[PDB]
């Protein structure tokens, strides 16, 4: 149909100008290529953790806590304390 | 694949695979365990022998 074919033409070659050709758009002043492709590509990381989300900051798992291998001082006091607690058993 | 122009899914997977060991485990209990075991076992053996002797008496 002419109304279909003409619509397809005006909506395809112009769609070519918008997307399929890097001619941006004459009717609209700011091209989306200088707006979306790189800066708004940081919009994904603007919503994400910037230079940190894609990066995934290095955080190595640490060691758990222990008694510093100290039986010279902790063992005797622990024994006395446990025996004192045993006085009401 | 759902992200056609991610251009970072390669990088993200690279970091993921290269971050297979973020760090190590910490099984540093190798002499503290021995000393705790020695103290506990000697004390418990003394307790058990004392209990048996009390039973006999």
UniProtKB/Swiss-Prot annotation, chain A:
A GO cellular component entry from the record: proton-transporting ATP synthase complex
Chain intervals for the UniProt region annotation (Disordered): 54-89
Any GO BP: cristae formation
Localization annotation: Mitochondrion; Mitochondrion inner membrane
Key words, A-Z: ATP synthesis, CF(0), Hydrogen ion transport, Ion transport, Membrane, Mitochondrion, Mitochondrion inner membrane, Transit peptide, Transport
Acidic residues compositional bias, start-end: 65-89
Family: Belongs to the ATPase h subunit family.
Primary role: Mitochondrial membrane ATP synthase (F(1)F(0) ATP synthase or Complex V) produces ATP from ADP in the presence of a proton gradient across the membrane which is generated by electron transport complexes of the respiratory chain. F-type ATPases consist of two structural domains, F(1) - containing the extramembraneous catalytic core and F(0) - containing the membrane proton channel, linked together by a central stalk and a peripheral stalk. During catalysis, ATP synthesis in the catalytic domain of F(1) is coupled via a rotary mechanism of the central stalk subunits to proton translocation.
Subunit annotation: F-type ATPases have 2 components, CF(1) - the catalytic core - and CF(0) - the membrane proton channel. In yeast, the dimeric form of ATP synthase consists of 17 polypeptides: alpha, beta, gamma, delta, epsilon, 4 (B), 5 (OSCP), 6 (A), 8, 9 (C), d, E (Tim11), f, g, h, i/j and k.
Comment field (misc): Present with 6140 molecules/cell in log phase SD medium.
Protein name as it appears in the record: ATP synthase subunit H, mitochondrial
Organism: Saccharomyces cerevisiae (strain ATCC 204508 / S288c)
Included stretch of the parent chain: 36 to 124 of 124
Curated annotation (Swiss-Prot), chain B:
Domain of life of the source: Eukaryota
Compartment(s) where it occurs, according to its Swiss-Prot or TrEMBL record: Mitochondrion; Mitochondrion inner membrane
Protein family (similarity comment): Belongs to the ATPase d subunit family.
Any further remark recorded for this protein: Present with 6820 molecules/cell in log phase SD medium.
Functional summary from the UniProt entry: Mitochondrial membrane ATP synthase (F(1)F(0) ATP synthase or Complex V) produces ATP from ADP in the presence of a proton gradient across the membrane which is generated by electron transport complexes of the respiratory chain. F-type ATPases consist of two structural domains, F(1) - containing the extramembraneous catalytic core, and F(0) - containing the membrane proton channel, linked together by a central stalk and a peripheral stalk. During catalysis, ATP synthesis in the catalytic domain of F(1) is coupled via a rotary mechanism of the central stalk subunits to proton translocation.
Quaternary data: F-type ATPases have 2 components, CF(1) - the catalytic core - and CF(0) - the membrane proton channel. In yeast, the dimeric form of ATP synthase consists of 17 polypeptides: alpha, beta, gamma, delta, epsilon, 4 (B), 5 (OSCP), 6 (A), 8, 9 (C), d, E (Tim11), f, g, h, i/j and k.
Listed name of the protein: ATP synthase subunit d, mitochondrial
Organism expressing this protein natively: Saccharomyces cerevisiae (strain ATCC 204508 / S288c) (Baker's yeast)
Gene, per the UniProt record: ATP7
Residues of the full protein shown: 61 to 117 of 174
């Amino acid at each position: 149909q002419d109304l279909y074919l003409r619509e397809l033409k005006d909506t395809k070659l112009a769609p070519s100008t918008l997307q399929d050709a890097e001619g941006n758009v004459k009717p609209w002043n700011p091209p989306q290529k200088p707006n979306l492709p790189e800066l708004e590509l940081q919009g994904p990381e603007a919503l994400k953790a910037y230079t940190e989300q894609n990066v995934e900051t290095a955080h190595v798992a640490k060691e758990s806590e222990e008694g510093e291998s100290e039986p010279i001082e902790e063992d005797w006091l622990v024994l006395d304390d446990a025996e004192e607690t045993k006085e009401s058993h | 694949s759902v992200l056609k122009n991610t251009s970072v899914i390669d990088k993200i997977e690279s970091y993921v695979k290269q971050y297979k060991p973020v760090k190590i485990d910490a099984s540093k209990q190798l002499q503290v365990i021995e000393s705790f075991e020695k103290h506990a076992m000697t004390n418990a053996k003394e307790t058990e022998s004392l209990v048996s002797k009390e039973l006999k008496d």
